[PDB]
Design a binder for these strands. Sequence first.
RNA 1: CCAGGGCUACACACGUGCUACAAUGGCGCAUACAAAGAGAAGCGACCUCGCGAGAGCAAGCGGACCUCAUAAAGUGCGUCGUAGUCCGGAUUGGAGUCUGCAACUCGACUCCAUGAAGUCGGAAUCGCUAGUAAUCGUGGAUCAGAAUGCCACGGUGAAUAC
RNA 2: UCCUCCUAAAGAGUAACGGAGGAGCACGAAGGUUGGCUAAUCCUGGUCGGACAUCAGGAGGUUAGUGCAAUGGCAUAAGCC
Lengths: 178, 79, 114
Amino acid sequence: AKLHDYYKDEVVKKLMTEFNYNSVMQVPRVEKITLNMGVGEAIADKKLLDNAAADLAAISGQKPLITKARKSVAGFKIRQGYPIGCKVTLRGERMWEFFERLITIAVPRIRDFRGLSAKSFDGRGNYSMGVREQIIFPEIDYDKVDRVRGLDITITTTAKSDEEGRALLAAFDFPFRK
Amino acid sequence: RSLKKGPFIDLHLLKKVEKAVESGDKKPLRTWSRRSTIFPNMIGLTIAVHNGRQHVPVFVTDEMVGHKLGEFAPTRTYR
Amino acid sequence: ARIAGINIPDHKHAVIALTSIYGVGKTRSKAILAAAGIAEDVKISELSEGQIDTLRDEVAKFVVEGDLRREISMSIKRLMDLGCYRGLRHRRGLPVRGQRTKTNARTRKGPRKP
RNA sequence: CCAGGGCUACACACGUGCUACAAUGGCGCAUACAAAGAGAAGCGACCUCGCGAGAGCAAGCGGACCUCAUAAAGUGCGUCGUAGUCCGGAUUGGAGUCUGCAACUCGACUCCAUGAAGUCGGAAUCGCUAGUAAUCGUGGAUCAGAAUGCCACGGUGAAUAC
RNA sequence: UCCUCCUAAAGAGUAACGGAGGAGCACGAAGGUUGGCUAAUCCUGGUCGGACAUCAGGAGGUUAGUGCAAUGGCAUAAGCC
């Protein structure tokens, strides 16, 4: 439904009517967001595939990528590359579904954000999110694994949002109504 | 930690505080009493607290509301 | 089921579950159950959703976990901003109440280091 | 003679004890006794409020009368079902009483919250032969207030000395 | 004994107890073909990831890589699947 939200809102009425801006191909577009896991040199774990395939096969029936190394350079004794991570880059309708389920778990209930979550500061266009707190799980066993959603989820963002950001939409933490 | 029915202020400390707020800004003077209760109304003094052989200055700030004057003066010396 | 935790408090009693939640002990757990109308001898496992919701409201009307933990944290930080005796003993890792450090300060000292 | 501080420090070492590591036990309710004591610059039931340490002109007593003073282990239950746990409380942070002119150095407690280590302890070593060892309460001295120490009293009460 | 560079004078060759290094193998895939792909390094946000493990973005252009020495190669890749 968040894809329908992107198609519907913030675009089609007021800037189309009063003062024209150029292109809906020029306004920023959410491409494939991604999620990665970061396990150690142990090969014997199955928990990584269990959690990633659970988050994928709650709707689908497919498996994540078991990634060894993009760089293929190791400081250990074996330079070839052990399988030490998982990749799921999200895809189209399922991308919008995962983004919507992340919003509908994190946003409407004040559970996670205690203080100012932004502490390490630099400028150039990165939003990785590591919750380290288990937010949702599809099975009836909510939290039995060693991993606590320590995985990173990457959103690429030119973090400026200038016009209506500094007009009305800052970010912060007062749930209000009409 | 003390009684909530009455704070403990020395009379000599009270007359030093009243004379200091009569004068306004003032260089620190040496006070020998460590048994004191401070207040947010009189936060702003630069009064100094004695602990034995050395005398240290104390500049009170906004967050201390009921603390002793002797807490900020370390009586003991460690390496 | 579970409210804001790492491990399942179920298959136990309600006072034990509300002690296993952080920031509420036995007496405040009994106060929570008394203000919620939930009996103590029943189990938090196989409890209905509405009673769990009333328990959630009872926990939320007082100070929650995490918020009281950071409240303790800025209390200790405010003592360190004072730089008083309590802040100095907190920085040195020495007892604050006033007990001895010649012997038997090993809880504040941790394991014994030669 | 004073005002502050130190005798209460803290990378360590040793001695004497207290609390526990649990089911012989932990938490809520009910239940019948003790003996020895002290009390006027005191003991202070009881009225009232508070899930609290506890706040008044409240009677009685200078002591078989009145107070401290509800004895507790135990006995009946309900529950926890061998877990670092409804075991233990160290430490720490909020809100306070009592004392004393004044509890930061540097008193005891209870109201709320967290719950380190601890899974019965190596070499080595200590006490005890009967109302004893163990275990459970109680009082007194110094004391303005502050004992896990000391003195002292009672409850249950062993095993083994060929 | 064999291989690579220089000496060696821009064809080949060319000596010294001249200057430097390697080989006496490996691979039934590390051969053939078809289809596909492109590195080293640097700057940033996140689970012991810390300076370097894995993602995502940008710069860069072969500074990588070649089963093993060195030289000449190699993107139509002979480099990777």
